[PDB]
Amino acid sequence: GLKKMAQPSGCVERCVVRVCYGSTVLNGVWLGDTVTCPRHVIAPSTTVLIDYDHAYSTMRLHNFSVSHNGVFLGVVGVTMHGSVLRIKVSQSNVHTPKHVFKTLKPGDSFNILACYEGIASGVFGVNLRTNFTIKGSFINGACGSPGYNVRNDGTVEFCYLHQIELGSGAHVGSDFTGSVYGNFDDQPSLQVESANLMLSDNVVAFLYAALLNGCRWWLCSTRVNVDGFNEWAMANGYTSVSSVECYSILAAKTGVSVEQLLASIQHLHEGFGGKNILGYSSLCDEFTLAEVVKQMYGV
Amino acid sequence: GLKKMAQPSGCVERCVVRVCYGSTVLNGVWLGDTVTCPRHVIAPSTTVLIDYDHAYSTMRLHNFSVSHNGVFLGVVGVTMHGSVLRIKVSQSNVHTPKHVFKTLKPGDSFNILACYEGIASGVFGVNLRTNFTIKGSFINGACGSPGYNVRNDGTVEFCYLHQIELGSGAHVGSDFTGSVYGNFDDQPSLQVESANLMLSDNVVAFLYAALLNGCRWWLCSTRVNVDGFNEWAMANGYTSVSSVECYSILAAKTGVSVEQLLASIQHLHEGFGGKNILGYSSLCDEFTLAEVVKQMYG
């Protein structure tokens, strides 16, 4: 069985704060004596293009209010870095977890802690898609909601801060250095993301999960090698497959080769008509190899 | 948009402990000075039917080890209540959240904190099905993983302790009184659960969600009243619809009566062939009214 799960949120919850500037409110992340939040918090109320360099030069520290669970923190200084602010506050978060900052790549899975007014309301796993957007569930006020991963040694990787929802409904964020994923503008615009490609590495993982569950009506005995599949993938809305050897644990157990699964993808590309694979009516790219392995075997 | 989410797990993570008896290890929940865990932990290693009353009668307190993040709690006494043990320990959990215990009904959504050796590894939302099982993700050692909801005032409702995986893959748990949901046996056996019905109230909530996203190709123009739908529901594997007036909010905003969605359920029952509703190719009973309302309007 396959269930999308999030990693536990407790150590990240203790870092979420409410950041207010004037009347504008969003979420920030408090590590040590620094709060990171989207710079949208200092935007003037207007319908014209936002000049953030001008808003930054006219910023006054006393217009900020930063709080953790209703306890207000004193603001010492603020610098702007791409699409985020770094707010120095006058005391350190005594529950700062061991952490690093990591910039995601397309195909990476991570966890979103969806937050409103400095308070977490939900947690879910997501994948950064090839168009550098995610499909989240955010209502008004989710700006600044953090994305994270928890390494095996317990280190939190801070990798995402929610920035904006595009007209299409797709969600855009930045890393903690202020670079927006996909170079989208961090203010209202008419921007549209590129077409989403199916994540081939995840699809291969999904088909191995199907095999391990005894679902194999779809298996091809044809073989397509990596170079051939990657050329087909270009023309058919799929990514290249990154490598084959990482699947060897699943390959030995099944015992089906990655190249057989690549041929199976080409066979199943259009539809299942109208059978299903693990309940899905079309190929699923939601689950990574690491998830299939960890959910099947704890590794 | 509709995404299955879990409520934040921080306050529950601080209650999970490792419970060991002899060589057998599983998870427990530490509230005040009590640890609740599945009684499977005192089972003898064997392939015969387990007699839990005899296992309990021959129990020795010194065979228990209860620990939280590597520090060991002193065990004071143990009682058995249905499928769970209540282990009294000599320390109170200083991180005990404000909490109540609540027994779930089919169609209720809740959150699972999946745990291994007393450490949380994943959190996800699930729905209790009409056969009283859930579709989770558990591998070996997840026994005792807790299920919970968090009310608006912050109170944690403890509602589920993971007990066993059935031969079908479906998951069985107990409440914190030790009653097994669906009264399945809490030991290895050949039991098979009865078939699931489609949770009609959840399907309605799902269709209200689609209307709010401009997904309306499936909307029936005509209506069927509740009494006619419930007759159809029996003969077609759906539960009876509860009431109509709960959906007033979404009935208002759409503005579509529940009776119109009931007619659409009848029409969509076979298949979409091959159109789509919010990503799904068949009707989805995964989301309750409360989740839809919370995810779209707060």
Dist CA B52 CA B39 (whole Å): 8
Dihedral (CA of A280, A282, A287, A291) sign: positive
| Closest Cβ–Cβ partner in A5, A9, A139 for B8 | A9
Cβ density class A48-74: b for 16+ within 10 Å, e for less: eebebeebeeebeeeebebbbeeeebe
Instruction: Tell me which amino acid residue B141 is.
Output: G
Dist CA B80 CA B43 (whole Å): 13
Across the A:B interface, residue pairs with CB atoms under 8 Å apart total: 96
CB A186 within 8 A of CB A26: no
Taking CA atoms, what residue in B is nearest to A272?
A: B274
Residue closest to A234 by CA, chosen among A127, A130, A93: A130
Residue closest to B286 by CA, chosen among B157, B134, B147, B104: B134
| Closest Cβ–Cβ partner in A5, A137, A295 for B1 | A137
State whether A139 and B298 contact (CB < 8 Å). yes
Q: What is the CATH number of the domain that holds A241?
A: 1.10.1840.10
Instruction: Tell me which amino acid residue B235 is.
Output: A
Residues of chain A positioned with their CB less than 8 A from the CB of B8: 9-10, 13, 113, 120-123
Which two structure tokens, joined as six digits, stand for B150?
């968090």
Q: What angle do CA A203, A206, A208 make, to 5 degrees?
A: 115
CB A158 within 8 A of CB A29: yes
φ/ψ of B96, rounded to 5, equals -65, 120
Task: State the catalytic residues of B.
Answer: 40, 143
Residue closest to A244 by CA, chosen among A210, A204, A281, A213: A204
Residues of B with CB under 8 A from a CB of A: 1-11, 13-14, 113-114, 116, 120-124, 135-137, 139-141, 169, 271, 274, 281-282, 295-298
Q: Is the preceding omega at residue A255 within 30 degrees of 0, hence cis? A: yes
Residues of chain B positioned with their CB less than 8 A from the CB of A123: 5-9, 123
Dist CA A101 CA A178 (whole Å): 11
DSSP element (H, E) containing B228: helix B226-234
Task: State the catalytic residues of A.
Answer: 40, 143
Domain extent at residue A79: 10-89
Crossing angle of helices A258-268/A226-235, nearest 10°? 20
Name every residue whose Cβ is closer than 8 Å to that of residue A16 and which is 6 or more positions away in sequence.
A27, A28, A29, A30, A68, A113, A115, A118, A119, A120, A146
CB A11 within 8 A of CB B119: no
Dist CA B240 CA B130 (whole Å): 12
| Closest Cβ–Cβ partner in A13, A274, A281 for B8 | A13
Dist CA B12 CA A125 (whole Å): 19
CB A123 within 8 A of CB A113: yes
Cα within 13 Å of Cα(A74), Cβ side = 3
Dist CA B9 CA B143 (whole Å): 18
Taking CA atoms, what residue in A is nearest to B150?
A: A121
Instruction: Tell me which amino acid residue A164 is.
Output: I
DSSP element (H, E) containing B162: strand B156-165
Beta bridge partners, B6, equal: A123
φ/ψ of B22, rounded to 5, equals 55, -125
State whether B5 and A124 contact (CB < 8 Å). yes
Residue closest to B142 by CA, chosen among A149, A210, A298, A292: A298
| Closest Cβ–Cβ partner in A5, A116, A139 for B122 | A5
Taking CA atoms, what residue in B is nearest to A125?
A: B5
Dist CA A124 CA B2 (whole Å): 12
Dist CA A24 CA A35 (whole Å): 16
Q: What is the CATH number of the domain that holds B85?
A: 2.40.10.10
CB A186 within 8 A of CB A174: yes
DSSP element (H, E) containing B165: strand B156-165
Dist CA B196 CA B282 (whole Å): 15
Q: What is the DSSP letter of B277?
A: B
Residue closest to B119 by CA, chosen among B200, B16, B207: B16
Dist CA A216 CA B149 (whole Å): 38
> What is the CA B40 to chain-centroid distance, rounded?
20
**For B129, left (φ over 0), alpha (ψ -120 to 50), or beta?**
beta
Dihedral (CA of B165, B166, B172, B177) sign: negative
State whether B6 and A116 contact (CB < 8 Å). no
Residue with tokens 């041929």: A263
Dist CA B14 CA B96 (whole Å): 8
What is the C-alpha R_g of chain A?
Answer: 22
DSSP element (H, E) containing B87: strand B84-89
Dist CA B169 CA B172 (whole Å): 10
Dist CA A14 CA B148 (whole Å): 20
Per-position DSSP letters for B108-156, written without gaps between them: -EEEEEEEETTEEEEEEEEE--TTS-B-----TT-TT-EEEEE-TTS-E
Distances (CA, A) of B239 to A7, B106, B129, B236, B262: 34, 10, 11, 9, 12
Dihedral (CA of A211, A214, A216, A221) sign: positive
If DSSP codes are grouped into helix, strand and coil, which group holds residue B233? helix
**For B4, left (φ over 0), alpha (ψ -120 to 50), or beta?**
beta
Taking CA atoms, what residue in A is nearest to B1?
A: A137
Instruction: Tell me which amino acid residue A117 is.
Output: E
If DSSP codes are grouped into helix, strand and coil, which group holds residue B64? strand
DSSP element (H, E) containing B267: helix B258-268
Residue closest to B87 by CA, chosen among B162, B52, B37, B51: B37
Which two structure tokens, joined as six digits, stand for A295?
């959910």
Distance from CA of B227 to the nearest CA of A (A): 31
Dist CA A296 CA A292 (whole Å): 6
State whether A137 and B113 contact (CB < 8 Å). no
Method by which this entry was solved: X-ray
Q: Count CB-CB contacts under 10 A for residue B267.
A: 12
Edge-to-edge strand list for the sheet holding A75-81: A71-73, A64-68, A16-21, A24-31, A34-38, A84-89, A75-81
Q: Count CB-CB contacts under 10 A for residue A282.
A: 15
CB A269 within 8 A of CB A283: yes
Resolution of the determined structure in angstroms stands at: 1.9
Taking CA atoms, what residue in A is nearest to B296?
A: A139
Dist CA B298 CA B238 (whole Å): 29
Dist CA A151 CA A13 (whole Å): 17
Dist CA B234 CA B229 (whole Å): 9
If DSSP codes are grouped into helix, strand and coil, which group holds residue A16? strand
CB A132 within 8 A of CB A106: yes
Q: What is the DSSP letter of A50?
A: P
A34: exposed, middle or buried (C-beta count within 10 Å: 0-12, 13-18, 19+)? buried
CB B237 within 8 A of CB B230: no
If DSSP codes are grouped into helix, strand and coil, which group holds residue A195? coil
Which two structure tokens, joined as six digits, stand for B253?
């905003």
φ/ψ of B267, rounded to 5, equals -70, -40
Beta bridge partners, A18, equal: A27, A67
Per-position DSSP letters for A108-164, written without gaps between them: -EEEEEEEETTEEEEEEEEE--TTS-B-----TT-TT-EEEEE-TTS-EEEEEEEEE
φ/ψ of B168, rounded to 5, equals -75, -10
Which two structure tokens, joined as six digits, stand for B77?
């006494």
Q: Count CB-CB contacts under 10 A for residue B237.
A: 12
Dihedral (CA of A253, A259, A262, A264) sign: negative
CB B143 within 8 A of CB B165: no
CB B50 within 8 A of CB B44: yes
